[PDB]
């Protein structure tokens with residue numbers, strides 16, 4: 082059977098790995114030959130694999146709990162634990178972090194490049210909301226041990242001149258990166274170890290590259306206290322859920338990829354993409370591609 | 385022609401009129417017999433009608449510019465203007481506010497409830513982001529003149545004890561309501577005037593009511609002298625883009641509605657909704673419906 086794709090431009094699609102920032106370009110990079118991401122992972126048969134969702138914006142904000150302490154050496158990095166409502170009992174067969182939570186990489190061992198939970202605040206002590214939400218720096222684990230630097234687990238630290246209220250719950254809305262955060266450091270994601278069924282690290286077919294649905298992330302700095310040196314960057318994804326939603330009506334034939342026509346202006350320039358059942362859409366043999374264009378189905382091809 | 389609906393629960397659907405907040409329940413209220421909203425308006429034949437979009441999360445954040453002034457009477461209500469990237473020249477045939485911007489109502493001439501735009505910050509004077517993004521209160525116009533107090537246009541006011549940098553861009557991410565803003569005040573939307581084709585007011589047929597895809601909006605206060613009166617509330621939407629996205633491969637037949645089966649638990653309880661072409665979900669003849677269920681197509685009925 083044939084596949085019908087609605088003519089929705091990528092500019093009208095959600096960036097699953099970074100909501101609140103629309104898709105600006107389709108990005109091709111020759112130095113990116115893998116994808117160890119946990120957000121934006123979709124499959125034809127398995128649905129939303131890994132830790133992704135079909136509602137990226139809804140599952141974007143999290144909560145954590147203070148741990149009444151600080152990391153060894155650095156007094157400002159108060160330790161804290163991510164709260165998981167989806168996995169209340171700590172089952173080793175289920176993901177530790179809440180579904181849809183951010184997975185931007187920060188580096189192996191770098192006390193110069195920290196993330197930015199642009200909005201973190203304590204509860205109101207009344208159960209109605211939160212209070213004094215402002216920009217703060219965060220990262221996964223403690224940046225000391227091998228198993229807690231890139232671990233994508235529930236332990237984090239928050240940079241704050243004062244001390245967090247012990248045992249009190251806080252909100253988390255990850256928006257921004259600070260320090261020496263380049264685009265390549267955000268493209269990598271923290272390693273996940275354990276038993277739970279996480280998404281594998283995919284690689285493109287031999288000789289082909291990947292379209293990334295890039296977006297521009299602005300800065301959110303502070304001009305007081307110790308200060309926040311946030312920087313502007315870019316974020317990439319595997320594919321938006323909007324494109325792959327249509328494919329579930331008639332799944333791909335057994336061991337068959339699809340040929341997609343990306344048409345920009347009338348019939349002047351029409352690029353060819355090859356979409357696989359594992360989630361990624363490959364091109365061939367990079368440069369940015371405008372988002373004002375629609376995807377059209379050509380035929381079914383063999384890998 | 386039949387309509388196949390994917391079994392996606394409403395808890396996995398985006399709330400158009402309030403992203404960053406998952407759908408909590410399906411809400412049906414007897415006193416709500418209309419919807420003058422400009423967000424969440426979709427049509428089977430006309431596409432995204434009014435001021436809505438298929439990417440509510442991407443187009444949620446806005447930018448405004450200062451006007452070097454304040455409202456008469458209240459010194460703290462600095463005046464600004466919402467800049468539209470989709471309508472650079474102020475053509476009266478296009479919507480004044482940028483597409484996808486918030487439309488939460490507040491009440492005409494109200495100095496007791498100022499839904500807070502929450503996150504607002506000045507530009508960094510570097511061209512790469514914004515700085516000191518903090519929680520501030522906002523509203524449309526100046527709450528004095530009938531033509532621009534509650535009229536959903538470019539003029540807004542921001543409450544800030546210190547003056548705003550004149551002629552500089554500011555970021556805004558509206559999230560929260562302050563003062564005595566109940567659920568009913570947020571339900572209504574500011575009136576629309578002009579020549580642009582805005583979404584009309586929808587009234588359900590006699591003897592039927594609506595399903596509202598409601599969600600819970602927390603509070604984000606401030607501990608300072610002036611402070612913020614942020615309160616918790618709920619937000620409702622007419623329709624989610626995920627449901628109407630499917631109904632485009634085969635559009636509805638000539639002047640016929642659809643009968644949808646909402647199946648809960650293990651099929652013990654099945655409710656029957658009526659979906660119309662205007663984009664509203666009729667639920668016959670209010671209480672609260674859980675989101676743990678999937679939609680199923682039954683037949684085509686005549687309104």
Ligand SMILES: C[C@@H]1O[C@@H](O[C@@H]2[C@@H](O[C@H]3O[C@H](CO)[C@H](O)[C@H](O)[C@H]3O)[C@@H](O)[C@@H](CO)O[C@@H]2O)[C@@H](O)[C@H](O)[C@@H]1O
Pocket residue numbers: 192193194195240260261307308309310
């Ligand atoms: C070397 C550096 O000196 C001070 O740096 C602060 C900035 O602090 C932040 O950035 C630094 C350098 O990248 C580093 O990543 C640190 O973990 C982080 O806190 C920042 O507060 C700016 C404010 O504009 O001021 C200085 O550049 C010191 O605070 C850092 O701890 C670090 O030793």
Ligand SMILES: C[C@@H]1O[C@@H](O[C@@H]2[C@@H](O[C@H]3O[C@H](CO)[C@H](O)[C@H](O)[C@H]3O)[C@@H](O)[C@@H](CO)O[C@@H]2O)[C@@H](O)[C@H](O)[C@@H]1O
Pocket residue numbers: 495496497498543563564608609610611612613
């Ligand atoms: C000092 C006090 O200020 C006003 O009441 C404040 C609140 O101010 C805020 O709310 C009121 C309406 O409730 C109004 O909308 C004002 O523009 C807004 O900023 C607020 O400061 C709270 C907590 O911080 O305290 C008071 O309720 C004013 O209404 C009072 O008459 C009085 O002057």
